[PDB]
């Protein structure tokens, strides 16, 4: 039950700054080294920075030195990455990872850092109305990734299929989330999709009824 919960990330202008954070639990955050790893879409993993258990020793990739700063708090059990002078090429999914010994067990879920001159746009949410019936939500025209969709605030998870977003010509994303539900629950059970777009603090609750 070791956990690495990451936070931060989102859309930043070229030249701008971002600080990523990694909350650690389930292990002595001391006694272990930590790294940041990033992954551009859809490229491979590249190592960004290393920090020892004390913070005494820190190392960087050449592609990153002078712009990125790694630090840790051994009381808060947190790992940080301060990023300055960001470029479009810095656009990636950023992972924190615990070190064992010259290897890395346990990774964070990753947070998406998007460096672009494009503006943030929140999505418009539209209901896709309906043994087993299909219904869903259209999440239309947002930027940037990601978007999360839950159903009935976490109560409904079975039969839920959230599709990967389409990238339109407009540069905006759209996705759909569809859940298969018993037709007998229709007209008795309420179905609400909970859409969250953090880059624009957009949270939309849409009721989906036949």
């Amino acid at each position: 039950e070791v956990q690495l919960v990451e936070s931060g990330g989102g859309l930043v202008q070229p030249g701008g700054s971002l600080r990523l954070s990694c909350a650690a639990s389930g292990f002595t955050f001391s006694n272990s080294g930590m790294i940041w790893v990033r992954q551009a879409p859809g490229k491979g993993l590249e190592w960004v920075s290393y920090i020892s258990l004390s913070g005494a020793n820190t190392y960087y990739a050449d592609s990153v030195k002078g712009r990125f700063t790694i630090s840790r708090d051994n009381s808060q059990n947190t790992l940080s990455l301060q990023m300055n002078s960001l470029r479009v090429e810095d656009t990636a999914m950023y992972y924190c990872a615990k070190e064992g010994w010259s290897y890395f067990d346990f990774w964070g879920q990753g947070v998406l850092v998007t460096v672009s001159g494009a503006s943030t746009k929140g999505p418009s949410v539209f209901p896709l109305a309906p043994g087993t019936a299909a219904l869903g939500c259209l999440v239309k025209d947002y930027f940037p990734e990601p978007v999360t969709v839950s159903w009935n605030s976490g109560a409904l998870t079975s039969g839920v299929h959230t599709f990967p977003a389409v990238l339109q010509s407009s540069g905006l994303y759209s996705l759909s989330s569809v859940v298969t539900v018993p037709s007998s629950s229709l007209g008795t059970q309420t179905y609400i999709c909970n859409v969250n777009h953090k880059p624009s603090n957009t949270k939309v609750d849409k009721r989906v009824e036949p």
Binding site: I35, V37, G44, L45, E46, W47, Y50, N57, Y59, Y60, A61, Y95, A97, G100, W101, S102, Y103, F104, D105, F106, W107, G108, Q109, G110, S124, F126, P127, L128, A129, A134, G136, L138, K140, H161, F163, P164, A165, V166, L167, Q168, S169, S174, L175, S176, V178
Partner: protein, 212 residues
């Protein structure tokens, strides 16, 4: 300066595959700090092998690692559909920095064919009141991961307004994709019907909606 991996490697179900990781005498040739990581699409990397050949609890013994000179090697035996993922080698280098491989995509071939399940949604009334119209075609549960989508109004082709994703593997190890047809509310109402045609392998499944 990078650990060289084969971009893609493919064998059939039950067979064994070996992935090479060629570095330098400053890393793989110099140390035992070689590790391997599995990453499925849309997930965080997972430690498979550490210290050249060791396995963490939870990794099947179908995964094994070895090393010879400046090249490390990961072998996967009894290829399964879950083994279909991206694989990365890693090594400690001399400036106490770490370095990852270019990655290898493993494809397992002799898997059962799967016909696409299609759900087609019409434009919602809420979107129409907003002077917009979007047709939503959801395509799931097909293998292999190649499909072709075509849209029809009544019985005629639509080239404009169509956005379609690249297929992606789901949790059921089948594939999913989606197609979006952008319309004006009048376009939607002028025609008798609209259809999404999904063609997989040779078969073609069609779904149809009407502004009732």
């Amino acid at each position: 300066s990078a650990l060289t991996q084969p971009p893609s490697v493919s064998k059939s179900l039950g067979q064994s595959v070996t992935i090479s990781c060629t570095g330098t005498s400053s890393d793989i040739g110099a140390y035992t700090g070689v590790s391997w990581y599995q990453q499925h699409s849309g997930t965080a990397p997972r430690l498979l092998i550490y210290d050249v050949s060791k396995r963490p609890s939870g990794v099947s013994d179908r995964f094994s690692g070895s090393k010879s000179g400046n090249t490390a090697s990961l072998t996967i035996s009894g290829l399964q559909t879950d083994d279909e993922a991206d694989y990365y080698c890693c090594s400690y280098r001399t400036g106490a920095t770490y370095i990852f491989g270019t990655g290898t995509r493993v494809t397992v071939l002799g898997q059962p064919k799967g016909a696409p399940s299609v759900t087609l949604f019409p434009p919602s009334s809420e979107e129409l009141q907003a002077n917009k119209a979007t047709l939503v075609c959801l395509i799931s549960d097909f293998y292999p991961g190649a499909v072709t989508v075509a849209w029809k109004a009544d019985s005629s082709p639509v080239k404009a307004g169509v956005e379609t994703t690249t297929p992606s593997k789901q949790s059921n190890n089948k594939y999913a994709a989606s197609s979006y047809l952008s319309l004006t509310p009048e376009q939607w109402k002028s025609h008798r019907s609209y259809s999404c045609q999904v063609t997989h392998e040779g078969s073609t499944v069609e779904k149809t909606v009407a502004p009732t």
